[PDB]
């Protein structure tokens, strides 16, 4: 049962559910496997898809196993994208 969601939306859920708005890459996996059981048995490559969407989407920024944080300037746009698909 694939989630009716994009990878950027799923990453946005994991990061906005963080108290600091930032998580390491391993925590994003744990969030997706916990809240969406499809990824527990999904074929390999979705973990690589998460790292691609982190680098490609401007909403996620690398802080300087690192951490990925939400860009406050892109939260309103990603939120509106979240609501459309809820
Ligand atoms: K990025």
């Amino acid at each position: 049962p694939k989630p009716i969601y994009s990878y950027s939306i799923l990453i946005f859920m994991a990061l906005k559910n963080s108290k600091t708005g930032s998580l390491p890459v391993s925590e994003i996996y744990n969030f997706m496997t916990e809240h969406f059981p499809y990824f527990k048995t999904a074929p390999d490559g979705w973990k690589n898809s998460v790292r691609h969407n982190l680098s490609l989407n401007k909403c996620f920024e690398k802080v300087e196993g690192c951490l990925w944080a939400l860009n406050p300037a892109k939260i309103d746009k990603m939120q509106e994208e979240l609501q459309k698909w809820k």
Side-chain angles (χ1 to χ4, degrees), residues 1 3-18 20-63 65-76 78-86:
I4 55 129
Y5 278 132
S6 160
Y7 281 111
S8 288
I9 301 299
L10 297 171
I11 296 176
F12 183 66
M13 297 187 194
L15 296 179
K16 90 181 189 68
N17 201 264
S18 172
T20 57
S22 56
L23 295 171
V25 187
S26 57
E27 294 284 349
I28 304 181
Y29 303 154
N30 296 13
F31 178 86
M32 294 168 57
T33 55
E34 179 183 5
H35 290 67
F36 301 88
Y38 165 79
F39 300 120
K40 294 187 183 303
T41 57
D44 191 65
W46 69 271
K47 287 187 173 181
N48 192 30
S49 297
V50 174
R51 288 189 297 272
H52 277 168
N53 281 264
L54 283 176
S55 299
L56 287 175
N57 201 314
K58 292 180 181 177
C59 177
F60 322 118
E61 293 287 340
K62 215 178 200 176
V63 310
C66 59
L67 305 161
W68 288 88
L70 292 174
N71 195 335
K74 319 297 183 188
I75 296 189
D76 288 332
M78 281 300 292
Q79 184 62 37
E80 293 181 9
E81 290 306 296
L82 211 207
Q83 324 231 48
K84 289 166 174 168
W85 285 107
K86 284 258 219 246

